[PDB]
Amino acid sequence: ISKILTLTHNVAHYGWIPFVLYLGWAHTSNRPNFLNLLSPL
Amino acid sequence: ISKILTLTHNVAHYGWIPFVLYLGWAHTSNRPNFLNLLSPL
Amino acid sequence: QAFKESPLYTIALNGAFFVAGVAFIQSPLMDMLAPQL
Amino acid sequence: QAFKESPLYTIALNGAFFVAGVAFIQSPLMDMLAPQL
Amino acid sequence: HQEQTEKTLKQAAYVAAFLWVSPMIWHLVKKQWK
Amino acid sequence: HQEQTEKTLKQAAYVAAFLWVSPMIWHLVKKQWK
Amino acid sequence: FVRNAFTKSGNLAWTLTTTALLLGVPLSLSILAEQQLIEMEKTF
Amino acid sequence: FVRNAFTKSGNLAWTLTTTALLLGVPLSLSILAEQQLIEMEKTF
Amino acid sequence: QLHSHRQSLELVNPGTVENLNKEVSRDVFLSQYFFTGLRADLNKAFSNPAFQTSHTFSIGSQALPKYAFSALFANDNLFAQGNIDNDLSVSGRLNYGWKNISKVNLQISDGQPTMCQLEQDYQASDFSVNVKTLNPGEFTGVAVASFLQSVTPQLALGLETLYSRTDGSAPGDAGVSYLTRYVSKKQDWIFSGQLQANGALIASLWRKVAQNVEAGIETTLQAIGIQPTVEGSTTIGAKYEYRQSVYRGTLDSNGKVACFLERKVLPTLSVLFCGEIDHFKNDTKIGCGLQFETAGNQELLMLQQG
Amino acid sequence: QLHSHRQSLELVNPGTVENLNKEVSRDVFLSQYFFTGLRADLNKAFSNPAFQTSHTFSIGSQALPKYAFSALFANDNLFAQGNIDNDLSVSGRLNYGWKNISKVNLQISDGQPTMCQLEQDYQASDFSVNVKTLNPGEFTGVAVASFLQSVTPQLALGLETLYSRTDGSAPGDAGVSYLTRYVSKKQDWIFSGQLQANGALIASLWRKVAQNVEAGIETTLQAIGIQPTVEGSTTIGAKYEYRQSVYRGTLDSNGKVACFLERKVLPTLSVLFCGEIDHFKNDTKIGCGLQFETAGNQELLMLQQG
Ligand SMILES: CCCCCCCCCCCCCC(=O)OC[C@H](COP(=O)(O)OCCN)OC(=O)CCCCCCCCCCCCC
Structure with missing residues (x-):
């Protein structure tokens, strides 16, 4: 259940x-x- | 007697x-x- | 070198550099370095 | 890597770089890099 | 350890000093004009 | 050691080769015109 | 695979553009230093 | 003595002239870049 | 009873705590412009709500990535950014300034887990307030407040606290500081000041000479019976602005010189140069490189020439 | 009987052995102009028999003195020099070219005892001869001769020997080489060549493109059963001369680039810049610095402006 607090931070990673x-x-x-x-135009 | 061969090289040193x-x-x-x-002028 | 190893040596050094330095800024001498053209 | 460690590997390498390089100099392609103005 | 018992009053005196001075310096214009 | 005995003839053949070829290549213009 | 077929051809686009900024930009400043002079003395 | 009374005052003439070539020469190039422009637009 | 007697003739408001020492340390002292290797960044803009897209190359510089994409976007009230580099590291910023603006600065690395922030501001015509936290029974992290206001039409002084607690079951500390700032009578020398925690103190000033020449001094004093260890460093700078050139350059105590020229030889291209001599170890660093911009819209590039 | 048949229609004379590969290696390849730190030399001239007096400062360069006085003097037939640096080291050169010129190059150091030389030349309209010794029952040292002459109006080839003997009671060796040089039909690509001792060989050419553009390639191959160890390096250069600018720049095998700009922004002052990227270790060297001259006579400086 706690993974969504860490999976949220891996949404902004990409x-x-x-x-x-x-x-x-x-x-x-x-x-x-x-x-x-x-780069050129 | 051999020093004059080395004293000659110490003349060009200075x-x-x-x-x-x-x-x-x-x-x-x-x-x-x-x-x-x-240096300047 | 009896006082150069003391800790109070530097706090008198840099504090003396501030006073003559700030007088160098507020001065007509510092006005001269600005080129007029 | 059975022949990259051989001594004959480099003398075929740099000798092959000479031939295509000297053709690049004697060429109308090298004339193009000189700016006309 | 009695260190953590007295540290809570070590810290509580620090914010209580800020509670005095910011209302103190709120109104020095009302008294600097002598 | 007999190495230094034969080295003097090892070296003397080297300058004797130069003694031939520089007079040899002195005048190839007098013979390249066939 | 992905972690080999890009970085082995991503680094190749680096070395061909830190080269052409090193041998081409000092040359480009030197053209203009002769470009503007040939027209300033064309005016007179 | 000779080997102390010169080199201890010879090195002092180094540090006062690798300084004034480092803080004075980029300033001197920047004056001329504004010096010649104020007269080129004085002509017109 | 006593409020309206003085609040009608006075109360110009000071700047924020970030812009306390801005006019010397980040304007006439080059300590954030310096680099070491070669670097050559370039950026296309097609803005009115702006837009940019900057790349950056670098080599042999010890503190720079070998690539850095970017972007931003800023209309009348917003901001954004973005910064990805060679392997992976993402950044980002926001502003939503409806007077109380409110920033967010996220910072993701890989070896170090995750940095986050939050900010606030308030400017109510006589005082400024900065409120800032860091990453947070669970009241953990760093939390910093401040206050600054002006009591005469030239002087202003305030203070700021903090509260740092880590290590789980650990109580946490709380430092304090004191701030001050004096302005000259007619738009001239601005003496600042500071006194932070653990003994360190700052002092500075900024004399505006005739048209485009400045000055500035700075001084820091940072401090089992071996603990009293003080140090010092007094620096002196200047800056000579012109049209199509900018030059600044400092020199200090304990032996150093520095220089930084920027000479824009085109309408839309510029080079630069920066170098430094040490006079104890007698060793030097030299860095140079360029920076130029272009346009991407079909008519914006037509409106920079003429 | 056979001499006068061909010596009336022919016999242009070639250059010396030193100027065999001069037109590529010391003209369009910057391998002797390069440096690393900062350097800023300056020289007053008051010349007609000339005269100069050059100083030189340098810092962080690993192969340069931190000071170098100089002088020279050169009328219609003479030469001299002199070069003293920071601690003590004296040099010197002479020329007395009445066609056989005769140089002397002395070189005094302190850790290494004494270097001396002697030279000779002869140019008799179809051949050149270089005779050179080094410091000498006592026939000791190095002695080098040469020969070079032309057999067609475009081609020339010769050779040179040596004889090195040290260590007192030691016999000594004697190597050999072979040389060649071809000139183009109408003042164009000049193919040189070489084959020295211990297997090494050189090859080059030099195409004169339209007005001021050159080219050039170079190639070396230098060579208990571990002794066959060959190596190689093929380099490609160019040079863009202009009025008040000079630019050259090479690139090669095994990974390197280089550049060298010289932009003379005054009548009598010029700056320069040189830098190099390696593409194996990914590390770089950057060197910059200036060079300018003045006058010391009361009217020579009046005759360089107008
Ligand atoms: C990986 C990607 C990397 C890309 C690398 C690209 C690098 C390109 C850098 C280009 C720099 C070229 C230097 C140059 O050409 O100088 C030009 C400029 C002056 O040229 P101007 O056009 O202004 O002249 C106008 C005519 N009146 O002069 C200048 O701009 C300032 C130069 C000042 C030199 C100062 C020398 C300092 C001397 C130090 C003394 C040391 C003594 C101890």
Whole structure:
């Protein structure tokens, strides 16, 4: 029963940085698709 | 008697770099006195 | 070296560096180092 | 790794690097890297 | 061990000092004007 | 030790090879023109 | 497997981009130092 | 003595001139980068 | 009966406890900008609610990852971040500042289990309050409060406590401190001060010279009959801001010098350099590297040139 | 009888044995310009018979003195030098080139007793000869001769010997080598070659691209039944000369890169930078520093500006 207190911490271990990209993907003119994980342009 | 073969090598140990300054001291317009051992001007 | 090993040696050292240092800041000498152009 | 420990492994390695390298120099590809301006 | 018995009053005097001084320094403007 | 006895003729053959080839390669322009 | 087929080809994308930032960026500063001079003296 | 009264005051002329080449030369490059700009835009 | 006599002519509010010594230690002293190896980070921005995406490479630096992705997002009232590096370590921050803002700073590692925080603030025109805990019959962890307010139009002083308890069946300690800050008469030299636990004390000031030149001094004194062990370090800095250049550089007691130039040779690219000489062991560290940005929107890059 | 048939249409003379591989190894490969710490040398000149006086500071470099005075003097036919450093070590060189020039290179240290040399040259329009000894019933030391001449208007090949004898009552050895050099048809790619003692061999070339771009490759193969131990290293360089900038930079086998920029930002002052990444141990070296000159005569400094 105590594992959910530790399984909650293992949700943020892999599912927090992808949440931040989804926020500002909508707060633009909503163009780009995969250029955001790319260095030149 | 053999010391003069070693005392000759101890003449160049202290008396060679001051010889080079005396050569080009004459091959100028013969102005400077002590500015040559000086960094700014 | 009879007092350089004492603990009170450093707290008189750095405290003396503050006083002359803070006088160097509040000064017209420190105004000179700012270039006017 | 039965021949990577042999002494003849390196003298075939660097000798193969010379041939493709010297072809890279004498080439119009090497002319391209000189900027025209 | 009687250390943990008196440590609870060692600690309780520490926060009780903060209970005096922050109401004390709440209103020094009402008295610094002499 | 007889090593130092024959080493002087080990070394003397080395400079004698140089004595042949540098006069040999002195004048290959006078014969490369066939 | 996953823990071998990525990191053995993830480290390869490092060495080809700490190289091209080391031999290419000092060259790129030196072009502009000759680029802007050929047009400043083109104006006169 | 000679081997003490010079080297104990020869090393002092080192530390006062590897300091003034370290805190003074990056400052001197930054003046000229603002010096030449204030006259290039004075011409126009 | 006595409240309204003085609360009509006064009460400018001071800054927070974090920004007490901000104007010297984190502005004119380079102790957080320094590095050792080579590093070259680059970041595309396509913002108004902003957006960034920064990468970072580094080599031979002893305190830096060899890769670091990032992101952020900040509209009129929010904040976020994210920072994953070469093997695995995730970070994150939040702000929800409706005047009482409220941060959360999580920090996951692998060898060390889990770091968490929480914060608070309040600025009610004459005083500031900072409330901060750490990771928590079970009242465990660290909990720090504070207080700071101003009693004259130039001076302000307050204090802060703490309460640290670990090790399970262990009572726990509680330290204390004292703070102070003086502002000059017309926007000039700001003398700060501090007196934390275990004897250590800080002092500083910040003289604003003519247009873009600053100054600053700092001084720390940190302290079986071998326990009195004091130490000291007095540092002196300056900073010469210009257009398209920034230069700062300090020197101190016990033998050190430092320098930090940043010369932006493009509209959108800049290099830097930082190096240090020690004068006891006679050994030196030199670090250099670049930093530049671009754009990803189809017209944002058109609106930075002209 | 046979001499005058070919000695009227031919016989351009080749360079010396020292300048055999000069146009690649000491021109486009930075293996003698590199350093590690900081260094900042400066030199006043008041020359026509020239004159210089150079100082040199360095710190944290593992192969450099922390001070080095110098001087030189060179009229139409003479040369001299001098180089004293921090504790004591004196050097010196001479030239008296009336066509057979004749150098002397003395080198005094303190832990190692005394180094001496002597040299010679001869250039008689179709061949070159280098004669060199070292410090000498007493025929002791090293003695090196050479020969090099050209048999076609583009090719040249010769050889050189040596004779090393130390340890008093010891006979001494004598190695041998072979040399070669080919020139292109119209002032272009120059293939050199070498085959020295103990198996080692060198190969190189040098393509002159359009205006100011070069190239170059180099290759060495240096070699109780554990004695066959060969090794190899193939390097590739380039050099981009410009007005008021010089850039070169190589990369090779077994994992290394290098770069060397020199950007002269004044008429009479210049900075430089050089750094290297290893890709096995993943560790790096960074060195930077400046170099500038001035004048000491009352009118020579007036004739470098305009
Ligand atoms: C793994 C990924 C790594 C990527 C690595 C990339 C590194 C690239 C670093 C580039 C640095 C190149 C240095 C350089 O070129 O200097 C240029 C700059 C001045 O050039 P400007 O364009 O400003 O000139 C304008 C013309 N009026 O000058 C400067 O910027 C400042 C340089 C100052 C040098 C100061 C020398 C200090 C001397 C110390 C003395 C020591 C004595 C003990």
